[PDB]
Structure formats: structure tokens, C-alpha cells
Amino acid sequence: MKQYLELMQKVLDEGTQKNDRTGTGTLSIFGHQMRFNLQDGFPLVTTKRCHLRSIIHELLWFLQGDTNIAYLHENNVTIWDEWADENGDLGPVYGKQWRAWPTPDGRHIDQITTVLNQLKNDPDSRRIIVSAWNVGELDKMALAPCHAFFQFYVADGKLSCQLYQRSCDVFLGLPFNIASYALLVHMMAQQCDLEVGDFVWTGGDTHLYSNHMDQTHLQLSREPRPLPKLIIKRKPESIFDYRFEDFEIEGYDPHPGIKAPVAI
Amino acid sequence: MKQYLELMQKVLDEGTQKNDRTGTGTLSIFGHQMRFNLQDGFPLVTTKRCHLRSIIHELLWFLQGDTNIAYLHENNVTIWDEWADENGDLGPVYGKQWRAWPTPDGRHIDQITTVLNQLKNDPDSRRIIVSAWNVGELDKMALAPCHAFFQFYVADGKLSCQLYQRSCDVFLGLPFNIASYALLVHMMAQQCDLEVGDFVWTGGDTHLYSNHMDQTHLQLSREPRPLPKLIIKRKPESIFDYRFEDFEIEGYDPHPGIKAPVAI
Ligand SMILES: C#CCN(Cc1ccc2[nH]c(N)nc(=O)c2c1)c1ccc(C(=O)N[C@@H](CCC(=O)O)C(=O)O)cc1
Ligand SMILES: C#CCN(Cc1ccc2[nH]c(N)nc(=O)c2c1)c1ccc(C(=O)N[C@@H](CCC(=O)O)C(=O)O)cc1
């Protein structure tokens, strides 16, 4: 997409060679924002083929409040393999925080149910947020949430959502998250009888790993193709009842996929 | 400031009429980001006279981990009176969440010290964040946090900061928060022997209350003056040992102040 590619070029031209946790090295910029009008099409990268099966199953895995990769495996998704323990657990990551944020007094908070109820009863609320940044549980998580916090908004019957991504792997992780949240907005809109609006991406440490330089240069040479469209074949009783079979991405003509090594 | 005035005009030009909790009515836009290079000067609004006293004392109050207005009153700061209970208490807001975020296992985390440790021992970390958005304590708070989350970043010996403000009252609150955060960055940098970089502001529901329109346009008819300069007359042993009297704002020649009704 034009926005995605311009961010890449931005990282190349302005990035600061930074040493990273993995000891790999990354070109990095701090602070960036982009807007994606969902009414223009699904923001799935066209300059490289993206794998939707992983994107869809991971999201349904989140909404279930699951933190064990068993479900992912059952559906051939291996993205979380390198971080799960001997038993497949990842600690209280996203899923747990979205559906069961633990209070100090022992209670748990369902942030998705709360959001649904706010969108339906109080759409003008400026407090429609879901946060995965639970400071008290960070040390138990296999990894600290990269897509840490997000906020919904309703204006003129349209549903918007801003995502704050503290750490962003521009090449691999980014295309995945854009598509993931764009999908959530669609599922939320359908459930709350609202039209889809803007999906705004905001990041902190936006970086490109040194061992992805070639792949980047390659992708940067491809002319972006028109954006596909999403079809939701069925309307479930709740945002928690969607199935992989319910989605379809029409008009998706991407350039060949580009393979790149994963940084653990 | 150029960036500030530009946001105001954006809100006016692309805003959407939206009702709000206070029952006042607002003009709102969702998603914005602006950058301030702290090297250029202290980011304090010059198109209207601002009251540094209230800003500085609030920050020191915050860092103390205090959440009772008694301190503020001793120094004639009344900016938090409308929300305090009979005993002057506001609940576990800012100060508390920063100095002692409660965990589910009976621990408490001092996010300020943690961040200081990272800035000195692991400045390349992508996890240097302080969150006030404690989902499990919101009901105890007098008001849900506006400036809910912030991230620090280091590069070329310069410290930068990005803040995510979920709800922003452009006319009243914004000028306070920007001056407040720039102050924090200067304090952090001095404690970590770093120079000041950029303050990146990101807002969710960015709005102007309908009863501030005239005051807004009055302010917009004004030419911003040169940015003041901040002089810190001492290097305390710790970030929590700063006093009001250590800060000097020099060259601050603002246009007349404009009064405007608060929305409780
Ligand atoms: C981000 C994220 C989610 N995930 C996993 C995952 C890994 C690290 C994380 N790190 C942090 N901090 N938070 C996360 O949510 C997170 C999630 C991803 C995993 C792999 C690829 C990847 O290798 N990309 C291939 C996948 C191909 C396939 O699955 O068939 C690609 O080319 O798209 C991308 C994203
Ligand atoms: C942000 C913030 C802190 N605050 C208060 C305050 C109020 C509501 C909030 N709401 C939420 N949710 N979070 C907050 O941080 C927050 C803070 C402010 C309060 C009042 C003025 C105000 O009345 N402005 C006068 C100041 C006069 C003076 O102090 O001398 C003016 O005319 O400018 C400014 C800032």
C-alpha cells in the first residue's frame, strides 16, 4: 500500500542504526502515524502476498481469551511457536488481557464485552479502550505486547480505531497487525450495526531489521495494486462466534510473496 | 505554537459535531500526531498567557506518588478541585499508577524508577513505557486518565518521548499537558546525562468544546512569538528531589490570556 511503502522508505532514509535485544541490529525511527480509510478497501499488502489464514485464526484465538498455541496448531498456525513453553502456554498475553484483565482484589474484567456495551449504549464515549499493557503481569508473559493499546470511536455512524504499537517490525509484523485490526473493526461494526471508518496506526519504535534490507529493497520496487474487499458471509450471535469460514477477501491480486528470516 | 494552532484549525476544518458526557457538545476529530523538537525551545503556548506554577507543581505532585490535593492547595494550585471528594482524594490516578501500579500478586511497581533504570542500563529497549491506564482500578478513579500512556526512546544521545492522549480538550488541557511532558523529558534527560530530543504527541478523540469557539478563533488571529527557554539551576540526587525553585523559564513574552469555562 502507498502508506506502508512510504513508511518503509522513511525508515531506510531516516533510520538510526540501533543495536537490538536479539543482537541483530535495526534501522529505526521513533513515532509515526498513518490512516487507512476502510471504506476504500481492505488494507492487506499487495506488494507481497500475505497469509490470511494465520491472521484470521490468531484473532479468533485472541477473542476466545486463549493464550495456548494448541488452537493455533489445530489450524496449522505456527507463528507463536518460538515463544511458547514446553506446554504451549505464553503466559497471560493478549487473549487473557482482552477477556480477563485481573484486578488487584481478585476480580477479572472483560474488555471486549465492555467495549461492545459502550459502542451500543454509549457510542460517544471517549473511553472506549482495550489495553494489553498490564504492567503487573508483563513479567509473566513470554513476550511483551507489541500492539499494546487500542481505542474505538464513533462519528456519523462510522466506527474508527486507533492502534498504538510500541514496537514494530516493519517488514514482517506490521502488514499482519494492520490486517488483523482492520478485520476486528469490521467484526465490531457488523455486531454494533455501524459502518466502518478509519483505522489509524500509530507506532513508537518503528524498525527494520538489518537482515531484511534486501527484501525491503525488492518490495519497494513493486507498484501497489488496488486494495481487496472483505466479505463476512454470516452474522454470528456475538463477536465471539465468528468462524474462519465466515470471511472472504475478494479482488486480492498480490505480487509474489517475499520470504525473510524471523528475529527471535 | 505553530503545531498547536495547526491542530486547532484542523479540528475546526474537519471536525464532527459530537455530544459528550459533560453535556456541553464538542467538535471532534479522531487521530492526530504532532512533533516538538525540544532543542528548538520550551514548548509553552505563547498565543495566550500560560500559568507555569500550576504545571510544575502538578508534575512534582505526580512524581511524589500523591493523589490528594492537599499538596496542591499548600501551593495555591486549584486545577483539580472540581473532582476531589470531601477529603481531597481523587483515587488511584496518575501519581499512584506511576509510583505504585498494583499487581494481582500483592506487589507494586514503580514505573518511574523502572524507566530510569532502563534509560541508563538499556536505553535501546523498546519497552520503556509508563502507563496510567489501569483497567482494573478505573472505577476507583475520580476521573479516567487522559494522558494515559507514554514511551521513551533514545538515539544519538538524545531522549524522546511519545504520549498517547485518549481524550484531548484542545483549548484548556492541551497547552498544560505539552508543557508538563516537556518538563518531564528535561528532568529525565538531566538524570540520565542525555540531551533532549522530540516530544511526540498523539491524540485519540481530539476536540474543542462548543463553548470555546470564540476564544479559539480569537487565539487563531494571533502570531506565535519565539519559544521560551528552560533553565534548570541544579541537578538533584534523584528525579524525585526537584523543587519548584529549580526551574527558570526565560524569554517568555506571551499574548494576553483568554479565559474559557471548564467542562466537568
Ligand atoms: C506481529 C505479529 C504476529 N506474529 C507473531 C508474534 C510474534 C512476536 C510478537 N512480538 C510481540 N512483542 N508481540 C506480538 O503480538 C508478537 C506476535 C507474527 C509471527 C510471524 C510472522 C512472520 O514470520 N511472517 C510470515 C508469516 C507467514 C505464515 O504465517 O504463513 C509472513 O511472511 O507474513 C509475522 C507475525
Ligand atoms: C491537563 C490538565 C490538568 N487540569 C485538570 C484536569 C482536569 C480534567 C482531567 N481529565 C482527565 N480525565 N485527565 C486529566 O489529566 C485531567 C486533568 C487542568 C484543569 C483546569 C485547567 C484550567 O482551568 N485552566 C485555567 C488555569 C488557570 C490557572 O491555573 O492559573 C486556564 O484558564 O487556563 C487547566 C488544566
Swiss-Prot record, chains A, B:
Catalyzes the reductive methylation of 2'-deoxyuridine-5'-monophosphate (dUMP) to 2'-deoxythymidine-5'-monophosphate (dTMP) while utilizing 5,10-methylenetetrahydrofolate (mTHF) as the methyl donor and reductant in the reaction, yielding dihydrofolate (DHF) as a by-product. This enzymatic reaction provides an intracellular de novo source of dTMP, an essential precursor for DNA biosynthesis. This protein also binds to its mRNA thus repressing its own translation. SUPFAM superfamilies: Thymidylate synthase/dCMP hydroxymethylase (SSF55831). Although not discussed in the published references, Met-1 is represented in the submitted PDB entries as being modified by either a formyl, or a carboxyl group. The N-terminal is probably N-(dihydroxymethyl)methionine, the hydrated form of N-formylmethionine. One of its GO terms (biological process) is dTMP biosynthetic process. This is Thymidylate synthase. GO terms for cellular component: cytosol. Pathway: Pyrimidine metabolism; dTTP biosynthesis. Keywords: Cytoplasm, Formylation, Methyltransferase, Nucleotide biosynthesis, Repressor, RNA-binding, Transferase, Translation regulation. It is found in: Cytoplasm. The lineage of its organism: Bacteria, Pseudomonadati, Pseudomonadota, Gammaproteobacteria, Enterobacterales. Homodimer. It catalyses: dUMP + (6R)-5,10-methylene-5,6,7,8-tetrahydrofolate = 7,8-dihydrofolate + dTMP. It holds the Pfam family Thymidylat_synt. NCBIfam families: PRK01827.1-3, PRK01827.1-5, thym_sym. PROSITE patterns: THYMIDYLATE_SYNTHASE.
